[PDB]
Amino acid sequence: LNGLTDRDLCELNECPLDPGGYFIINGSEKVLIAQEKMATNTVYVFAKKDSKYAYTGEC
Amino acid sequence: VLLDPADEKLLEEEIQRSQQHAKVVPWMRKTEYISTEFN
């Protein structure tokens, strides 16, 4: 469905407005939700005062 | 016949408004419908 015209999308019975970005898995439309995380390879410093540590650096 | 648009206008009784539809109003656009030719 790539580089494909409105005429062709209509002829495939598929929406021209459909964004994309989802999977069909057993005839179900599935989206992968963007999971956030702490950035890799980047040093951080925090105060876990609830411990033997006054400060912890992390990577 | 010998007649003029100046004469023609005089045959009517009264025929000779709200002009503000076509105002600029930079905060007011136009509408969009369903074509068959787009991105």
Swiss-Prot record, chain B:
Cross-link (Glycyl lysine isopeptide (Lys-Gly) (interchain with G-Cter in SUMO2)) at residue(s): 30
Domain of life, per lineage: Eukaryota
Protein's cellular compartments: Nucleus
Quaternary structure and interacting proteins, as annotated: Component of the PAF1 complex, which consists of CDC73, PAF1, LEO1, CTR9, RTF1 and SKIC8. The PAF1 complex interacts with PHF5A. Interacts with POLR2A, TCEA1, SKIC3, KMT2A/MLL1, SUPT5H, RNF20 and RNF40. Interacts with UBE2E1. Interacts with PINT87aa which is encoded by the circular form of the long non-coding RNA LINC-PINT; the interaction enhances the binding of the PAF1 complex to target gene promoters and may anchor the complex on target gene promoters, sequentially pausing RNA polymerase II-induced mRNA elongation.
Protein's job: Component of the PAF1 complex (PAF1C) which has multiple functions during transcription by RNA polymerase II and is implicated in regulation of development and maintenance of embryonic stem cell pluripotency. PAF1C associates with RNA polymerase II through interaction with POLR2A CTD non-phosphorylated and 'Ser-2'- and 'Ser-5'-phosphorylated forms and is involved in transcriptional elongation, acting both independently and synergistically with TCEA1 and in cooperation with the DSIF complex and HTATSF1. PAF1C is required for transcription of Hox and Wnt target genes.
Protein family membership: Belongs to the PAF1 family.
Name recorded for this polypeptide: RNA polymerase II-associated factor 1 homolog
Organism listed in the record: Homo sapiens (Human)
Lineage: Eukaryota, Metazoa, Chordata, Craniata, Vertebrata
Residues included from the entire protein: 98 to 142 of 531
